[PDB]
Amino acid sequence: SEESQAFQRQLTALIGYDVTDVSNVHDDELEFTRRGLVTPRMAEVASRDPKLYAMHPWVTSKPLPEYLWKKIANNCIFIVIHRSTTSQTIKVSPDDTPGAILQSFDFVLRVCGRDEYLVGETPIKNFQWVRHCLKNGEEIHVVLDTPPDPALDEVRKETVSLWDCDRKFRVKIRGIDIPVLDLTVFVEANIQHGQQVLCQRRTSPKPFTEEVLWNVWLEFSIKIKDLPKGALLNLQIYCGKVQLLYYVNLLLIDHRFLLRRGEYVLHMWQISSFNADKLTSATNPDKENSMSISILLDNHPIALPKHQVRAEMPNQLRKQLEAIIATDPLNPLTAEDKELLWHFRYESLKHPKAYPKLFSSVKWGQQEIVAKTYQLLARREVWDQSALDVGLTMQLLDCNFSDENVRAIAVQKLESLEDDDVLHYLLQLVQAVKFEPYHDSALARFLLKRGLRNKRIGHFLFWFLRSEIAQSRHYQQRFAVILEAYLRGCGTAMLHDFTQQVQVIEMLQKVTLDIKSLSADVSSQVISQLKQKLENLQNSQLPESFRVPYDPGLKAGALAIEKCKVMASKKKPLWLEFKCADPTALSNETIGIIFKHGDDLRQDMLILQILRIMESIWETESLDLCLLPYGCISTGDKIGMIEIVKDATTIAKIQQSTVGGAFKDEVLNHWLKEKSPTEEKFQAAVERFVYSCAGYCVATFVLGIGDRHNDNIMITETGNLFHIDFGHKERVPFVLTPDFLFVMGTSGKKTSPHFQKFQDICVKAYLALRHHTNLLIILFSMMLMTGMPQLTSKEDIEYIRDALTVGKNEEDAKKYFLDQIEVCRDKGWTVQFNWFL
Numbered sequence: 078s079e080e081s082q083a084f085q086r087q088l089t090a091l092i093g094y095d096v097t098d099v100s101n102v103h104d105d106e107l108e109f110t111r112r113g114l115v116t117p118r119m120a121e122v123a124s125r126d127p128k129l130y131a132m133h134p135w136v137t138s139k140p141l142p143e144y145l146w147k148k149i150a151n152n153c154i155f156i157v158i159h160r161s162t163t164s165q166t167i168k169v170s171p172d173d174t175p176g177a178i179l180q181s182f183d184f185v186l187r188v189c190g191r192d193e194y195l196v197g198e199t200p201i202k203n204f205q206w207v208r209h210c211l212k213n214g215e216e217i218h219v220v221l222d223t224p225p226d227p228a229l230d231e232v233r234k235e236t237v238s239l240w241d242c243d244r245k246f247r248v249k250i251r252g253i254d255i256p257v258l259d260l261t262v263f264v265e266a267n268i269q270h271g272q273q274v275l276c277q278r279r280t281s282p283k284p285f286t287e288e289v290l291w292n293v294w295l296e297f298s299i300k301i302k303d304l305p306k307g308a309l310l311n312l313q314i315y316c317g318k319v320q321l322l323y324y325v326n327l328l329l330i331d332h333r334f335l336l337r338r339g340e341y342v343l344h345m346w347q348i349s350s351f352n353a354d355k356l357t358s359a360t361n362p363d364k365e366n367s368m369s370i371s372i373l374l375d376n377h378p379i380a381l382p383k384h385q386v387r388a389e390m391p392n393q394l395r396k397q398l399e400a401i402i403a404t405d406p407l408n409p410l411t412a413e414d415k416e417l418l419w420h421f422r423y424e425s426l427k428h429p430k431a432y433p434k435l436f437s438s439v440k441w442g443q444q445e446i447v448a449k450t451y452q453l454l455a456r457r458e459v460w461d462q463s464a465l466d467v468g469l470t471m472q473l474l475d476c477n478f479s480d481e482n483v484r485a486i487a488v489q490k491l492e493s494l495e496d497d498d499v500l501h502y503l504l505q506l507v508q509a510v511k512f513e514p515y516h517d518s519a520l521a522r523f524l525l526k527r528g529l530r531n532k533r534i535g536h537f538l539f540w541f542l543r544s545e546i547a548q549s550r551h552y553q554q555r556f557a558v559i560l561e562a563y564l565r566g567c568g569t570a571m572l573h574d575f576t577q578q579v580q581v582i583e584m585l586q587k588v589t590l591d592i593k594s595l596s597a598d599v600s601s602q603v604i605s606q607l608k609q610k611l612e613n614l615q616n617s618q619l620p621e622s623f624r625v626p627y628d629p630g631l632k633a634g635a636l637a638i639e640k641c642k643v644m645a646s647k648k649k650p651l652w653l654e655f656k657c658a659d660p661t662a663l664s665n666e667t668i669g670i671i672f673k674h675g676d677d678l679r680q681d682m683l684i685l686q687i688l689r690i691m692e693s694i695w696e697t698e699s700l701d702l703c704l705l706p707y708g709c710i711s712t713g714d715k716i717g718m719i720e721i722v723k724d725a726t727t728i729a730k731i732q733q734s735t736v737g738g739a740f741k742d743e744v745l746n747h748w749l750k751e752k753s754p755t756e757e758k759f760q761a762a763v764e765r766f767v768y769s770c771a772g773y774c775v776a777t778f779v780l781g782i783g784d785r786h787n788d789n790i791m792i793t794e795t796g797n798l799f800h801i802d803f804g805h806k807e808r809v810p811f812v813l814t815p816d817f818l819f820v821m822g823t824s825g826k827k828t829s830p831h832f833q834k835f836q837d838i839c840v841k842a843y844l845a846l847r848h849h850t851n852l853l854i855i856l857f858s859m860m861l862m863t864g865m866p867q868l869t870s871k872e873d874i875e876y877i878r879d880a881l882t883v884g885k886n887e888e889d890a891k892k893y894f895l896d897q898i899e900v901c902r903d904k905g906w907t908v909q910f911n912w913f914l
């Protein structure tokens with residue numbers, strides 16, 4: 078192929094991994110998957126409306142909430158339209174379509190300052206930019222523009238059956254080899270499906286030298302016909318109480334439905350226990366330093382075939398079944414429970430909420446049972462007609478399920494998600510790719526086609542996939558195949574966008590890392606050295622304008638060198654500021670970004686996303702708790718960017734300026750007054766604080782991250798509180814300190830008008846989250862598994878069960894949470910003071 082040479086290396090520098098490389102494979106799954114994704118790519122590319130794809134209108138079909146109607150005066154909003162020098166203002170009703178305003182004044186209404194458009198058949202109240210304005214109380218400024226050319230979006234032109242085999246499965250362990258290393262060592266071989274271990278065998282313990290041989294057949298009790306698709310041979314290495322040092326995995330049935338055969342020399346992963354890294358079919362790329370195991374699967378090709386009633390039951394049984402279905406997802410199922418669910422299979426099928434539990438009662442090491450299960454899936458009318466529950470759907474995409482048909486019925490439910498909701502779960506859906514047994518899956522193809530069908534989903538998919546590719550040896554190959562698949566259909570315009578973005582951050586990360594080296598306080602020298610490189614970059618070869626990765630609407634321009642600094646933190650992050658590249662912008666506020674190496678911003682990404690989910694949960698119940706979940710992208714290993722929230726300082730530094738060093742109550746409130754221009758704006762600031770505080774109180778308690786040092790809480794000059802830095806004796810539920818309480822109007826032990834309102838919001842916020850207990854549990858589980866490097870135990874996850882008081886009735890839980898506030902009215906500054914040491 079000709080010009081494809083430069084285009085492929087163009088893709089490689091965008092992805093940050095060579096997709097064509099074959100040095101770290103032992104089959105053709107990755108390449109098969111590239112070829113496999115061509116069709117779903119072509120199918121989506123060819124069927125999208127070229128023009129709607131260009132203006133990417135960001136819209137929603139949810140009701141406009143209670144808290145936003147009371148903002149509209151007399152069923153009429155104001156839209157300032159802009160010509161050249163001066164503007165004109167028009168009055169419009171919440172239902173007026175973009176078209177119904179094109180007459181009153183072919184042209185298109187682009188937002189002032191942003192690459193966002195108001196086009197297409199949706200009411201203007203249904204546009205997100207509008208709901209943003211209304212929320213913060215801001216004027217809607219648009220410009221009369223020419224529609225962007227769809228030509229810019231142009232895409233570059235492009236035999237023995239298994240069930241006839243009653244033989245027992247066997248695998249030969251030749252031995253383990255390690256280039257460099259006193260105990261004994263054995264190998265453990267597990268047949269696995271999900272995380273259920275079907276069969277297990279061990280070798281005898283040999284002395285741990287740099288090469289160990291066994292040459293033994295481990296005969297299993299499971300038969301070849303009884304092996305289900307997606308079953309992992311999991312080979313582990315222990316020494317010796319025993320300890321696990323190395324693990325590795327191999328799919329027994331391959332992507333062609335063929336039983337795995339022949340010689341394999343698999344390089345293995347180390348340890349430092351539920352962790353998504355432990356499930357991967359990928360092998361260690363580090364050939365020179367890693368341990369390896371050598372095996373033989375001896376066996377005509379043995380292909381796996383593709384598959385082509387009671388409802389009357391006793392009283393106490395039906396109730397026992399419903400008690401089982403009405404438990405949380407973390408509640409374990411006994412043998413008796415499982416045996417019950419399977420027998421009444423068909424009664425269970427009528428309840429969508431039974432599905433996780435029901436498919437966790439299947440004996441996957443039994444061909445005739447799985448056969449009955451597939452027949453059971455062929456009759457899923459009730460599931461098919463049910464309204465989409467994301468939390469139930471999530472459950473079926475986690476580590477406990479490895480059956481493609483089971484997982485496909487979940488991915489079926491996600492199809493009905495409007496693009497606004499995909500964005501709400503995209504991060505967690507992307508991470509859920511780690512639980513897929515195979516590189517080609519419904520879930521992967523779903524992400525692929527939702528990204529090709531939408532520039533916004535497409536933008537965030539890019540960085541989400543890129544984040545993991547840059548810092549996951551366990552999953553970089555898989556995500557890389559998917560990302561390439563996406564880029565080969567996103568269109569020339571975006572490819573060029575992505576190139577600028579990659580080039581800018583790769584440049585700025587260098588400057589971030591160089592500066593960190595040069596410090597042992599913001600010393601005289603460093604100040605000028607940073608400004609040295611930042612003026613070096615302004616001409617060669619930083620493109621004059623790039624999209625903000627955490628806010629794809631915003632074009633950033635030239636560095637405001639004067640305003641850039643290194644910060645007085647121990648990790649020396651950058652404080653960078655940019656002119657807005659758009660001359661049609663009506664502000665002059667710079668775009669502030671922090672670049673930081675040192676923290677794990679993947680954890681920050683996840684926690685932030687969950688916060689956005691809690692916000693939308695509250696929207697369903699007409700609540701707004703004014704959380705500030707700022708942009709944060711993980712660009713690499715322990716490195717990324719953060720949005721600078723304008724006009725904000727930490728709590729501790731407010732306590733520093735009055736004292737310097739503990740601790741005074743009124744400080745905050747008289748800091749608040751000295752930033753309010755009126756008195757009206759001051760009480761609005763007290764109001765924003767009442768909600769803000771309550772918001773982070775509820776959210777952090779549930780997540781178990783409420784007990785925090787107070788230079789990790791921030792506030793804006795308009796009262797908006799918010800936590801930061803989510804990287805990683807006697808305790809406290811959350812941070813309700815006596816200075817917070819003084820703002821609400823209380824001093825010691827009283828109930829002020831504002832403090833009641835606080836308790837009012839908290840209680841409602843908490844119980845609102847409890848209406849989504851299941852969903853939060855799964856999100857939280859998934860987060861711990863794909864985002865925390867901690868070999869997360871059951872006990873780490875069982876925290877949120879307690880926090881959300883599962884089982885407890887509505888009344889009893891409200892009093893449980895009010896106990897919590899009262900424990901904050903017991904320690905005051907004692908926990909804060911303890912940090913100081």
Ligand SMILES: N#CCNc1ncnc(-n2c(Nc3cccc(O)c3)nc3ccccc32)n1
Pocket residue numbers: 646671673676681707709719720721722723724725726727801802803
């Ligand atoms: N005006 C204004 C300030 N605006 C602002 N907005 C967001 N963050 C910060 N900020 C973060 N951010 C952060 C750092 C690591 C992780 C993470 O999640 C957030 N660290 C900080 C340390 C000292 C001071 C501010 C910090 N500031």
